[PDB]
Design a protein around this ligand. Sequence first.
Ligand SMILES: OC[C@H]1O[C@H](O[C@H]2[C@H](O)[C@@H](O)[C@@H](O)O[C@@H]2CO)[C@H](O)[C@@H](O)[C@@H]1O
Ligand code: MG
Length: 391
Amino acid sequence: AVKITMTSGGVGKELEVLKKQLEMFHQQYPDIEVEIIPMPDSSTERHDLYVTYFAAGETDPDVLMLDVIWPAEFAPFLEDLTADKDYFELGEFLPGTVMSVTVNGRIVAVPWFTDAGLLYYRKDLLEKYGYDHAPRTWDELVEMAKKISQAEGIHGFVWQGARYEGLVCDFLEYLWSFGGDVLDESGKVVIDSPEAVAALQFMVDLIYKHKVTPEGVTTYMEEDARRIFQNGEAVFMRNWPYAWSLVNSDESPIKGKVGVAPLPMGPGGRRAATLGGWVLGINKFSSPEEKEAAKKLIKFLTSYDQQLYKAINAGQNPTRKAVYKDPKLKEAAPFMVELLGVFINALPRPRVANYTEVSDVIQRYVHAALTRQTTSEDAIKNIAKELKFLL
Ligand SMILES: OC[C@H]1O[C@H](O[C@H]2[C@H](O)[C@@H](O)[C@@H](O)O[C@@H]2CO)[C@H](O)[C@@H](O)[C@@H]1O
Ligand SMILES: [Mg+2]
């Protein structure tokens, strides 16, 4: 009787799983009908779509699938949910995810699933070549990748190097593990450092010196790296947990041969993973009847049983604490439970209302360095300069 719309991506199996979740939702709320609006794979491109939605004052979409990096920017256009804190049972959620949706003391979204970078590796190939463990340092990964890739005739290491938000997530994991940072605890840009130049040079060296990563990586997003790994054509892959639901399914040629581990440590004496995730917000311009229906859909989708269903079938990490005690979860995706320390310790991108502009600066110069249009020193030097103008 009440019609609402919801945006969704189509990466992996998430759209297929959502349709099934909506079918279960309609059994519980036949008075509400939901239409899915599909989105492009790129988070950067999705961001621009939302800007045009809010600029026009559109009453659709009603439920917004938002990247964890957007709440600070999009808070003026989102329904304030602070009074619904107990309605959504936010006390049951991972506290870090609730902090991500809190903007100036106001709750502007409900956490749906959380994310962190992980290392996928061909466990069969590592044992075949005398390695009983996942690489613990970046240098050990290169050594393993070099030896196995030329013996087997496949790529060593695939990741996300296209000029979009995914590149920033990959770059920060190298920057942080090498001992650098973008901003200090105050506002000051500190990215102009020898550690940052070394981190970016290492990414360049993976392609041109060590030759463990194909130059085509400068066009890869999440799914491009996933297919190459899934088809047995890469020893290592950096990606999010979702890829597990596909590379270990019955349709995968490498099912049962995939291991998951934290990303390796760097010269900074520490390993790091970029915090990711997606949250559900409500369009401020929707009618009050639509907002009420949207609240029921968001509560249903973020309930215990639905978070478990999404985790098992789409490989996306729950935001409710208690789901990690469920034996069904450990059965489907053991790394989600065993590597929980990775997800609570995942480092966030800078939380500023203009992050997408900060990300755009990082995208241009990092990608330019990966394609050899500039050097690592000039790239880092130009990032710092233009970031200081933004901040
Ligand atoms: O590409 C950057 C983006 O990656 C992650 O989002 C993925 C997610 O992991 C997948 O499960 C699926 O939802 O596709 C998304 C990309 O559209 C991070 O969650 C996100 O924070 C990050 O910006
Ligand atoms: Mg509407």
